[PDB]
């Protein structure tokens, strides 16, 4: 695994239920999709 980091301004985090999610710092947007594909 470890595909790398996330592209500048996205992250691996997690949301109140348990999912994981990729947010952008840049546009501040909540995406699912894995970029680190």
Do not use: C
């Amino acid at each position: 695994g470890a595909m790398g980091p996330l592209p500048p301004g996205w992250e691996k985090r997690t949301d109140s239920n348990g999912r994981v999610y990729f947010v952008n710092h840049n546009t501040r947007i909540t995406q699912w999709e894995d970029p680190r594909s």
